[PDB]
Amino acid sequence: PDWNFEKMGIGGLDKEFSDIFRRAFASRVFPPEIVEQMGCKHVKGILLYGPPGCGKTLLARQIGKMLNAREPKVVNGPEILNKYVGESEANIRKLFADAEEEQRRLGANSGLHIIIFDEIDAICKQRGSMAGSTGVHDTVVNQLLSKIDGVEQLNNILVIGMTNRPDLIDEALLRPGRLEVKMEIGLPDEKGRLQILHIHTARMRGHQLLSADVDIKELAVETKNFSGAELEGLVRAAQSTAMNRHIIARGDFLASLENDIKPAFGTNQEDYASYIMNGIIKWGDPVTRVLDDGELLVQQTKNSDRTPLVSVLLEGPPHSGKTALAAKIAEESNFPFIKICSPDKMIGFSETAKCQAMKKIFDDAYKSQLSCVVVDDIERLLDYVPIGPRFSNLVLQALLVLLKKAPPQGRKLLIIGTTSRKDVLQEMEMLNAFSTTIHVPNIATGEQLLEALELLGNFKDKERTTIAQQVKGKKVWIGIKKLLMLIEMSLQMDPEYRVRKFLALLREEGA
Amino acid sequence: AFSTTIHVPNIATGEQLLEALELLGNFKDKERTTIAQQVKGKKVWIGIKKLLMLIEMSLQMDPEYRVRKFLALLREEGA
Amino acid sequence: AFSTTIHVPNIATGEQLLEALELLGNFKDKERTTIAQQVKGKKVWIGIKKLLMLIEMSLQMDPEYRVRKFLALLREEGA
């Protein structure tokens, strides 16, 4: 048995490699004298899927190193497509034909010619047969499988499939014998990451550049979700500070410093700022009780085995910063995975491009254990307008099934809408699908207003005395983003005229 | 085009509802009995998949306020 | 554009019904005496392609509740 992971190359996924070893590759490592009776033909092909950056391509070559081929030829799918019809399929034919010579020449004792596809998922779209929608590339796959399971079948081969979209592949491409067996890779647990860190450090520890104040046990777990690929870049970044340390003139952690730089596959901390200008200004009880409620039912999820999915939307009148509150609710529990979906970046897209950004985000999210995702300004991406009813049916349809779509077993998430008007939604039947709602009343009163202004501190006691004298009495109904807007508009004034400008403008709010 | 149809009734009855709690065991005898005093001679029309979210959302709470918000959020739906 | 039409009628009479059942032979005369006394004087609008579902869907029950369900189902459509 040659399958031990004390060999350094990869780690953390030990069970999955064990499995392929268990049922996939046992035939090829066993004394053949027995099986030569049984005539058991080997797996010709295998599939493994998972997130992109989790070190799958070093598995394949490692089994090639483990059980020696001449060498791998690795290819990328898009590296072969041609406008000219003949060329693309022919390339594949060359790849296979390299082996057939040895197989027929040297019979059935030949060594493996191994193949790897970096991503199939474009080429292996599931063709379907009818007069229309035959397909664009539906004829390359025929040549492929005809090589795999075809006439003059060969036992001289091994082929590795790779994808991040396992469901689009045709079911016959992967029927048993052509590729029988599938494995899932999922983003590694902290144990796998401490192994990986042991790996990439193993030279540094030996060369003793980094001798001190370095613990992988904490430094692994402080990140709950990363890809093993980024960590090597991280280690390279960790290597960069010692070289950026000698710009001034034997190694230090800069990891705690640099982790803020890195966009993860998972959570990001640097996207708040555009959404959070000012932080969370608590003007009164409703604000704090709301985000307290957020902190309340988040625990529901994290402590629930029977409700993986939960959902709310923060409704309220406009310009109350519901977006910001949702962002804070995300930021409050230090989740593994948080992400924004917003029209800001999906701008100027068709009804089926933004959908494919959205399915991308959630199926990206499904495979994390615990997550919080947020969608802002539902009305906008739904492309709602009152004059005419107009919207894209596609979007809400594909959205609400996701609100009713449970992720795979053992993974849980909550989802957050910021919709500012729900009458449409009640009419449009998204509101029965959401579990529950939050009214976010905008500030209704001056006694709360001046309090907030004291928290900001723009205005003096006299400037504030002005307000306190004139109106205690009105109930002003105002969204706060507008408040900030016009104080900044009055903050520029002749000081004597500063305040009553604010007041006069403020009395134009309506209702 | 469809041959026949079958109406799944939603759960009208408090007793029937109470039996499910009795079945699931999310709630203890003391509170369930408190509900029995509270809700009987009563018709309640709420969804099952709604119920799950209710009992759990309350089941994460401190016990004193737990049931109180439960039936409050339940009575949020009259019919 | 159509040169002519044909109205196809739908089964109007327990008479046509029960003789159709004489034809199929699924139900024998004894139970049909009951169904006779049930249909006479009343009108029926149902087409047979739906009937031929009702026949077997009732058939799969035990014989005693057989015909009572059959007609009791047909109450819905006949009304």
Ligand SMILES: Nc1ncnc2c1ncn2[C@@H]1O[C@H](COP(=O)(O)OP(=O)(O)OP(=O)(O)O)[C@@H](O)[C@H]1O
């Ligand atoms: N606790 C708070 N109360 C009120 N406003 C806050 C609070 N915390 C932050 N904000 C402010 O909310 C503003 C965000 O704007 P806002 O999200 O209200 O526009 P919007 O509501 O998305 O627009 P629309 O009303 O069309 O949805 C920021 O300036 C932010 O500082």
Ligand SMILES: Nc1ncnc2c1ncn2[C@@H]1O[C@H](COP(=O)(O)OP(=O)(O)O)[C@@H](O)[C@H]1O
């Ligand atoms: N144990 C491991 N787990 C995850 N990733 C690893 C591990 N060991 C190495 N890696 C990194 O995983 C990366 C995989 O990159 P590659 O396979 O080229 O892109 P993709 O993973 O998207 O196909 C490699 O660059 C490698 O540095």
